[PDB]
Amino acid sequence: MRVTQKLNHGWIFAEGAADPATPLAGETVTLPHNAVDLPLSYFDETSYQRAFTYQRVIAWDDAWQGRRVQLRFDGAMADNVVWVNGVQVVAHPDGYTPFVADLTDHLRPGDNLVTVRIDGSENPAIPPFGAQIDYLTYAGIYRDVWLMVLPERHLTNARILTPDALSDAKTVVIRPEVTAPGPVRARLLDGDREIAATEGEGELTLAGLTGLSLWSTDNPQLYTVELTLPDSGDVTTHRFGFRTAEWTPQGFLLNGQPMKLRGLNRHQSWAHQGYAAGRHAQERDAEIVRHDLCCNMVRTSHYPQSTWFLDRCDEIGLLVFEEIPGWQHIGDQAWQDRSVDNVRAMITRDWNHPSIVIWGVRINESPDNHDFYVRTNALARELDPTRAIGGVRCITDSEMLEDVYTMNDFILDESELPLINRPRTALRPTEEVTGIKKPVPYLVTEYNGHMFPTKAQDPELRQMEHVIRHLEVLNAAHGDPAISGCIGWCMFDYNTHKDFGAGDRICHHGVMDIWREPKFAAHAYGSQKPPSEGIVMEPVTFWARGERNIGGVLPLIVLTNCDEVEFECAGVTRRVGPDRERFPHLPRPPVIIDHRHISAEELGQWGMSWHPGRITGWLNGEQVALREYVADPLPTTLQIAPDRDTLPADGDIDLRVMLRALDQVGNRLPFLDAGIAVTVDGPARLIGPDLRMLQGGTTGMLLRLTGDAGTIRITARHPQFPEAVATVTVG
Amino acid sequence: MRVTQKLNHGWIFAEGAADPATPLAGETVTLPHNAVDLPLSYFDETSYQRAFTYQRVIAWDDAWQGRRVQLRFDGAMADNVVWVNGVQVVAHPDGYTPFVADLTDHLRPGDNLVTVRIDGSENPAIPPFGAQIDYLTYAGIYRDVWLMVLPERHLTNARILTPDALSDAKTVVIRPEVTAPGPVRARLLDGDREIAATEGEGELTLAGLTGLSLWSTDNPQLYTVELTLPDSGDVTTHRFGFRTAEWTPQGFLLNGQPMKLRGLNRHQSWAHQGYAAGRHAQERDAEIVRHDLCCNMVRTSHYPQSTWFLDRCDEIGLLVFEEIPGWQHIGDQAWQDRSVDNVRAMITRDWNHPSIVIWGVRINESPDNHDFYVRTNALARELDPTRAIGGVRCITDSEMLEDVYTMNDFILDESELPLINRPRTALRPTEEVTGIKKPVPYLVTEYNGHMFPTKAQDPELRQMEHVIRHLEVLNAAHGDPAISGCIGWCMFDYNTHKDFGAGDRICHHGVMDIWREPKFAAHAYGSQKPPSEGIVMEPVTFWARGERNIGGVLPLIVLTNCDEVEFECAGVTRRVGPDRERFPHLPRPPVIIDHRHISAEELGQWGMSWHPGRITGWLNGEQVALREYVADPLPTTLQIAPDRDTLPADGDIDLRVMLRALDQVGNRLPFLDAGIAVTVDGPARLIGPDLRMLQGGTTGMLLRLTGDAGTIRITARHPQFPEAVATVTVG
Ligand SMILES: OC[C@H]1O[C@@H](O)[C@H](O)[C@@H](O)[C@H]1O
Ligand SMILES: OC[C@H]1O[C@@H](O)[C@H](O)[C@@H](O)[C@H]1O
């Protein structure tokens, strides 16, 4: 057979450009690596825009004679090139798509010298460069690498296909790809239970499929296709799922039934480390998206992302939008050629993930460009008749070659501007935008963001308007049948170029911060889930008397699953239901507590003094939830929150750990400006500042495991707080 | 020749209450002192509500026989008592006023023990306690102590009258207060020179003095009176000035010439050390109003303050408004009694400061009290006819027993409450607020604060509004002649109780931070000075792109005293002046730059990249103020600016030292969350911790000098910043 085999241990990293054949000397690392570890805010950002060599050593194996030996690189940013005992074996410019390097014909006995060039700089013949970008690219080898040892005659990709997916007698078709002719053979699998099999050169088929269940956002049922080549014993497997995803102007319909998309954009970027984050860490994002913020769709801003991520979206029933790399700029016809190669490299790679339902074949917010775009549109339409074609824009009146008019609607809010008559309007009617009163399939890919930046620690009062603005929009969409869904700007706070942000190198556009800890808006999104799916009730305050203008906590937003919510404090008491008279169209509108339900006279015409409080949620009058606010919060618990207490002896893993400063009854302390000093022992490295600074009463950190067994042990100290510790076992 | 040694040293401090006879082991400490030293935020505030003790090692002298020995306690909080070798010479409850302890009798050869039981409990019987308060009282003998060996015949007090401040030849009337009837000699003098003398039975007059100066805000001329007793040889100095404060429905009058009053409110709360800070520091605060904020007035909120401050304001041309300790609450007979007693203690102490021009005899913002106030009112006026009187309120139609109707117009912004017609108003028409058909002296004493809170870290848009509102008030006040000027709430943010603030024990109301470092809205008071003193030009922005909703920094505020202002960026260039249309009545309306000066498309030039700017300021064609912002702020200089290079070798002095995280071209990094690891060697302790947090890009500390001489090496470091070292010499 074959032996696909990770090989991320034992790489030599060196700042610069070294003679490729002489044993390189430099620092020793395990992949994924990120060449230039950054601060959190206020940094150079070009620091990384330079040369870097990595190297690896591989001894001949008596076991490999006349078998191929290839390095699959899952990815590396950017302008890449590969050597083998000093001979160049692949140049691959794009820093998002993978590439193979064949070693065979330059391996000699004993150890051999594989060498790798990275130039991490904004090389305008490589997309997405040659102008500004509101996101950072970093550099290094930031994805996996795999030592494959393949037979001569062997198997390089397959497309699995689903004609009449909603037949009770389902159907499966496979197009293998190979290096010579010869019988190809294959096996449908559900767990270890063999469902079917066929045999043949060309398109293998299986039909009349009694007994299988459909992939969905509820039910992510996956199935597997083993492929063998009889005449060399090569074998491979591909997962896929049975599902339909139509974009008819009347709406979007999965598997027949219609479905309004809620959703958020996601970068693959972390603090300090950039894109050097592996299977686990990635697997998280997706999980948080689907569950925490309960979206039925993600979009990959503004490139292809990790296979690991896309795997995960498959496994948890989360829809996807996947876009070629770009950010509003087009270069010359050379670059257009380059750009049209990514389309190929992108779709070919991910034409089997059932999660992906649409493709992005426009550069982000670019002008029209008939002659180019014609190409990309043509190109996927052939590479994949199955998934619908789409692109992104922010002008109205565009040259829709694409199947679905996928716009960014930043109308909220321009009442604000001094020249504007348009009364504050959340989204536009579809034909203002589309330039055709002919109905067409229509989605909104981003909104808000730079329109209303909102920092972790921004005033109680601001973070209200912030949340409300996410509601106003979600409520716009769900109302209009014309609009298939929405997708807000954005999932978390990212590092950017100097050109954007608060000039701190941060766009503060998340609903969670950069650690994936949620700011108040997270429970607009997270709160549209059903109670069956989990029970949600956050009030949107810190229960501070004179934190707001004037003071008190009214009006009060409670974000929730529940019929009703109880205000209880100072002797005063009210039940209140969700505010349809302001948010008809939301699945789970939130509760507003108002003059309507209370006056300042009931609390008692500002009878000075501040009293603790108590909120409860209700579900067919069964007291489901309860959140308490002390009137005088003192530091009590210095929380230490690893996502997991247990992990395997795995080097790849990046462990996210959160930290909170909590008052008596549990709530976070939102304004303690301070730094938590921390230690970490046993088989992780911390990544970043040993001193960690709170924002919103909170921060987090990742711990790049060393791959060896042990217990990891973690202090966190601050002279207001009893001395905190936590541990997890490794192996 | 009296001996008046000054003995804040050699003291002993402990928690709880010993028998006042015997030895007491507690640490060798110095005064001013705070009993239990607090965090900057989120702490107990009941921490200091226990008994403590101060005992002293005092020696007899052969030098002292037939000569009264007396410790003078200049101020201490609270419920304070004295014992000499276990016998009790004085009770005083009230922790803002001075009180005397006569040991004389209770003395023996060798070493006599002196004790002080003090307790920081909010005793309901004791003004200022009862119920709630928006400030902390702390504990500690936070002020001075003096030892005084007196002749048995002696001068306890005197009062300096000044009829005809204005006449070309000037009287000085003197009314010494002496233990025994008998002769008293009075030499007026100019710091060095004589001017006249007089001996006297009874009342001492110095009529006819030609060629002396009026004391005014413009120029502070002081003169000292010197009192001898020939009988006992007792000697004391009293200092005063030659002024006239007329208050009239027409307006406030100083030496006849009219004056729109303009000022802010003030606490002795320091961060960490509470009330306990030394002369030098007390002075610096009087200094930072008058000189930086060009403020002609200050309100000692809410109690009497250090004579070290009150001296300072006589010295530097800063009028004063002082009042009895208190906060809305009114006690039983006992406590009201304690108050008229507190009026008495206050006037008697400060009847000779020219700076002071008005007495707050009403408990701050109480509801009216016929029986109780007619008392304080009537009382004060019998103690002091020379000056006028008001008492602070927030309620209308009020029993005006006072000379001046002192009002807290927080009208702005009340319409933000939904149950409100009234369209936005900065100040109420006097007519309505008094409910007195006749016009009467009106002064606005507080405004803003809790109406619009603003952390120093808070975002541009909020900051511009802070500023806006501050300006809006000042304008109105200058605009209406029935209003005799006004006073902003407040100078700096002050530590506080659980019923008030952001939950963190701060009320974020200062136009400066708690370290007397300016927020943007400090330059609204700063830019009212005539250029001919100094030149101020301060834009309001951080010059980051995505910081404000949408982006850019238009419209822009520049706060100035200049004919013109020239804005420059990416080849757009414009002269702009005072927006006088928006603030007709102001002295230095500021420059605003908006759509009327730079159009929509004219921004089109800029493309998508972000650009350096330069704001130049002008004065009669000459170019005065330049201000450079760049677009890619990096960590450049971590600044350490002490108040002073060179100093006295002096135990009392508390040196303020500021810190600043700075970019290339001068500017601060407003959203740079990081602690600065500090260290101090040289002859002084550091008040607060090693690690100080950059709030708003800045952060402050205070070093208490030891009394030793020499070289204070202070060090800041942080890893994004070049390590920095600053010195200050001591002698
Ligand atoms: O709201 C800010 C956003 O604007 C979008 O149009 C762009 O694609 C994003 O990366 C980000 O710049
Ligand atoms: O509500 C709290 C604040 O506002 C004023 O009404 C009061 O006089 C101030 O002392 C301050 O404490």
Ligand SMILES: OC[C@H]1O[C@H](O)[C@H](O)[C@@H](O)[C@@H]1O
């Ligand atoms: O025990 C805590 C709670 O008890 C009481 O029910 C009070 O009404 C509530 O405000 C308080 O927080």
Ligand SMILES: [Cl-]
């Ligand atoms: Cl079959």
Ligand SMILES: [Cl-]
């Ligand atoms: Cl129409």
Ligand SMILES: [Cl-]
């Ligand atoms: Cl009486």
Ligand SMILES: [Cl-]
């Ligand atoms: Cl005087």
